[PDB]
Amino acid sequence: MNGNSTNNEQLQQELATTQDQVASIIESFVELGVSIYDFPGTPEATKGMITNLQRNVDRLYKLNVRSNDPQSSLSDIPLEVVQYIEDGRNPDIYTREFVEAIRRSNQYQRGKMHGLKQLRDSLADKIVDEFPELKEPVEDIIKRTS
């Protein structure tokens, strides 16, 4: 029990660190774009642009190196999820409808199981009734099924 909790905590910490690093990368890219749009052409601005580019490259390299560690806890995303997330929204209706379909399938399964159970119970009862000589195997049939 303690090992699973420790592994979960380590995975959460690693994912939080990755999230923070990627957020910093995104902020640096936003700053880079802002500087490019409002570039004055001064040598100091050029040096700042070079430093920002170097920092972005170093951050990307560090993220690639850390995320590729075989010992990292990071090591499924279906293509349908990628297709659904391309619609500019908050990702809930896909899960809602597909879980609704899942629940409908489960309810169908339970209802058909109950129906089949009553079917074979009634059939066993009547086979015992009109055919007492076959009563003994029928119960064994239940033992063979249940």
Binding site: A23, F29, S67, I77, T95, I102
Partner: protein
């Protein structure tokens, strides 16, 4: 199952290749083109790369939230089309065996 590390490595390799191609194209592009157009193209490329990295960020956040719901979801789906396949197999068996009737 696709490893997240492999996806991240592929995305980084694609980003590096795109950046190298853009730098090369800027290198052999004639100087007659205004620097404003090149700056705009570089900004657009940076925005696209940032969007890809933000998609990776969203995937990382989802994995941080992560599989329990995914595992239940996949198991219930497997049960569903297994039942459907059993129904179709029953129908096919009756269609085939009607000849022997």
């Amino acid at each position: 199952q696709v490893s997240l590390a492999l996806v991240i490595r592929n995305l980084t390799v694609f980003t590096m290749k795109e950046l190298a191609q853009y730098m090369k194209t800027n290198v052999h592009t004639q100087a007659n083109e205004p620097n404003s157009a090149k700056k705009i193209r570089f900004l657009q490329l940076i925005i696209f790369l940032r969007t890809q990295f933000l998609k990776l960020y969203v995937l990382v956040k989802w994995t941080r939230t992560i599989h329990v719901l995914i595992d239940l979801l996949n198991w219930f789906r497997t049960t569903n089309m297994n039942v459907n396949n059993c129904i179709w197999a029953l129908k096919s068996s009756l269609n085939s065996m009607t000849n022997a009737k």
